[PDB]
Design a protein around this ligand. Sequence first.
Ligand SMILES: Nc1ncnc2c1ncn2[C@@H]1O[C@H](COP(=O)(O)OP(=O)(O)OP(=O)(O)O)[C@@H](O)[C@H]1O
Ligand SMILES: Nc1ncnc2c1ncn2[C@@H]1O[C@H](COP(=O)(O)OP(=O)(O)OP(=O)(O)O)[C@@H](O)[C@H]1O
Ligand SMILES: [Cl-]
Ligand SMILES: [Cl-]
Ligand SMILES: [Mg+2]
Ligand SMILES: [Mg+2]
Lengths: 496, 475
Amino acid sequence: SRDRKYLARLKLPPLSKCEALRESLDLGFEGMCLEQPIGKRLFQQFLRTHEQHGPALQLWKDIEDYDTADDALRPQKAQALRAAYLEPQAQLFCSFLDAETVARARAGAGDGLFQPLLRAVLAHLGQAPFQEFLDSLYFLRFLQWKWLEAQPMGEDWFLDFRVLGRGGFGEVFACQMKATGKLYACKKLNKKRLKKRKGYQGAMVEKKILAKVHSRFIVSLAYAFETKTDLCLVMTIMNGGDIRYHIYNVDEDNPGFQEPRAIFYTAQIVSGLEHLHQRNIIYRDLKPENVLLDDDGNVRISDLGLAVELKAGQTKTKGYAGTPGFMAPELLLGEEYDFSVDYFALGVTLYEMIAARGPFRARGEKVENKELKQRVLEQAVTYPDKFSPASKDFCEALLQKDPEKRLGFRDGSCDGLRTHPLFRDISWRQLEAGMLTPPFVPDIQDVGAFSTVKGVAFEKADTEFFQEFASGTCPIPWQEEMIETGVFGDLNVWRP
Amino acid sequence: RDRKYLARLKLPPLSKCEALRESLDLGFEGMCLEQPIGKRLFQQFLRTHEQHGPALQLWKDIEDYDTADDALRPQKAQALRAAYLEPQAQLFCSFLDAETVARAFQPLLRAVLAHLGQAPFQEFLDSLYFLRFLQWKWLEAQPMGEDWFLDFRVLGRGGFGEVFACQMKATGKLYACKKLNKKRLKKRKGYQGAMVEKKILAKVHSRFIVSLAYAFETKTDLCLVMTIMNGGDIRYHIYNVDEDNPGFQEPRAIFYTAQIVSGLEHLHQRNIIYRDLKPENVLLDDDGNVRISDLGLAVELKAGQTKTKGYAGTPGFMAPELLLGEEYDFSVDYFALGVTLYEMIAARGPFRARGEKVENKELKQRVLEQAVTYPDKFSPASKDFCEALLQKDPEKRLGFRDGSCDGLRTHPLFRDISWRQLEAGMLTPPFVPDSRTEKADTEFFQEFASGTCPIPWQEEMIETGVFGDLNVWRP
Ligand SMILES: Nc1ncnc2c1ncn2[C@@H]1O[C@H](COP(=O)(O)OP(=O)(O)OP(=O)(O)O)[C@@H](O)[C@H]1O
Ligand SMILES: Nc1ncnc2c1ncn2[C@@H]1O[C@H](COP(=O)(O)OP(=O)(O)OP(=O)(O)O)[C@@H](O)[C@H]1O
Ligand SMILES: [Cl-]
Ligand SMILES: [Cl-]
Ligand SMILES: [Mg+2]
Ligand SMILES: [Mg+2]
């Protein structure tokens, strides 16, 4: 239900304790009032109580409302937006805009109808309105909230209550943040085992990535902390079960997804790959057992241990890594490679979703990595009658052995891929916004211990890696937790 | 109200309040108890912090109890006692002594406020509510002179200028504006008097004295904005509510006397002598309650001074000691009270007949030498009271004792008067008026024109509704 002891420690502090934060912090408008949820709220509360900024705020709200409205209501909403904010005599008309910006808004028509208008509003709001905000109690309230965000919230704050899964380095428990009662998944990594098997680099890249990236198609890191025996990641709980499980379990006699389900999962995965690729990350571990369903039937990618962050200027990488059967020819051959490898994995995943087997080996056949390698390099993929002509087409485009001919990430987006006929019946606008009804709404045993790890002592280098790994609370998710969970509502009161 | 002016009522950016932060009286009593916005913000803050919830609600309930009606008080005592003093009750005040709970209401309040002045206040200072307070104290200190008031009709005439009824343009609250002509003030040397009136009306806060809100200057006048009193003066009422049967009837006279006393008391407790109590100076409001006014001849007694000298006041109301040349204290005001009550009942002074023209020299001689006689209109209790007050020797005169008029309130005249309900403005009055009836110069004017007085302004901001409007967090 949630713990008295810990709730009582979520309390906005006195102002004098926020003097430190005041300076050593990001004053950035985009960072404070656009990307950080509490930051956003407080900024909008500020604009709401200053009458002059009413017309900007409402346009802002009304644009965000329009971006996620249903296709039915849109034309109507698009008109009411133009009628309220873009006619020189309307009550909430927006002086601060160019003629050229107001003109384009009135005349636009398409996928990103009001994104130039939103950019203009945000640019305006980022000027004086923001400067006034900084000079106001609402900004100070933000600091109180940031102060709280930075208070220690380590192992004591989470209650493991059941086993969700098992990794190479530890179990993954369902757990509750005792203060707010929110449910998370807590992936535990045994410190001695990590050392002995030399999995530190892998552990760090997963945390670095889950930390920095915010996408509804990638599991999100909330907290990182350490216990005496383990490193712990607290992340988005996914109770649905991995895709692979559902491919073989939905029908034992007739395994595989009906195509609309496989296209929905494919679209969601793609959108996850695109968020990674836009941030110069190569996943390198896409495959059915790493795609998780949540309580509603929505998927996200997971297991980022094999991912590589490309540096500034770097467009390619090298390194043998991945699961046999999903690694692209480039990778197998030892060549330099980019994001293409992930699209090759995508195709093998789509394949398996449809056909209940890999493109390169029959169901329940043992094939050794050496042989499975030559298959991937030399074998033409055959497609059984199970596949529609659209799904054959798409896989063929992803299974292209030559990366340069492979479909995928061009011009900083996946928009090319999205127009492929397979997605004919998908509102990408809505998929990305999290609105579409998923196709199948869903509805573990504890093994005990991992074997003893004899003869492993820690050096300072090990301890530093652990303190570095245990970097604490991630702002955006914590702030999200505070809001969804009611704690923001309670503590942000002025006079109840 | 006015858009242009209401528009100027806006809370400032926090950076503009760093001036006030370090140059204001941080005292607890002044900030959170006396000042209405500081009080609201303190309470708002406390309500926010649950640990302090018990203390807040107790304070509130003691004040609600103190202003309830006699019929309800017993049940509010029991509920307060059971709700805050039983050890098992949820809202139990841990902080209080065992010695004070056994004793338990005024003492209790002093204990609760004592506690709220320690940690709770210190936490408040380190909170957003104090900064909001500083915001409101910036707006308070902003310039609000001649331009903000629009005078709309004359209410009366004095010796140094007219007294208009005007309205504050931004809040639409009506006041009275006593305007003094600068040139006239110098030529008649009224400087000291206008100054004394202003400093006194600024510093005292009682429902029975007119309250200064603002104080400013035009090119031609020095202007005092104060509590509007549309009921007219008491003299006017003695001789025009009925010209055939002038005078008041006793319970009415007893009513106003009680109010005058309380006002007199308030001045005396703060070492002030009114020195000019008389019916033409007691004014009525629209509800029918009175307030003393025209404090120009008031003297402020310093620390460690029990008496003063100085011939000042209105002939026939100045007491023997003062006329004689002796030293005197608050007792002179009680002598003027006696005269005042007498005139309220008998439609004539005790030292002259109605319409009898007598001059200062002889009027003096009478005040010193004449035995006051009482017609039948005076009941035995009225008689005894006036006799007490008009006793020519100040030693034998009923007056201010042991820092209070508690002694004088005991007199049989006020047997029908519930004191807390009067002193708390609750009692219905006995008559409700009908709505239908050189360089050293320029430095003095600047120094006179001090500006806005906090308490009444804060009060104005709440009653008028501006506080509710501009103190919002998420509407
Ligand atoms: N967010 C989550 N919600 C629910 N279950 C999860 C979550 N993340 C991982 N799991 C489960 O936890 C276990 C570990 O998965 P994960 O892929 O993170 O481990 P891993 O040790 O990195 O695997 P590998 O060694 O193959 O890289 C699996 O049973 C997986 O299904
Ligand atoms: N608050 C008020 N509300 C309404 N009328 C008032 C108020 N104050 C003064 N007046 C009017 O102005 C008249 C004279 O006021 P007041 O006695 O203060 O002037 P003054 O010049 O100080 O008088 P004096 O000449 O005795 O010093 C009063 O009789 C009354 O009619
Ligand atoms: Cl503010
Ligand atoms: Cl299906
Ligand atoms: Mg891993
Ligand atoms: Mg007068």
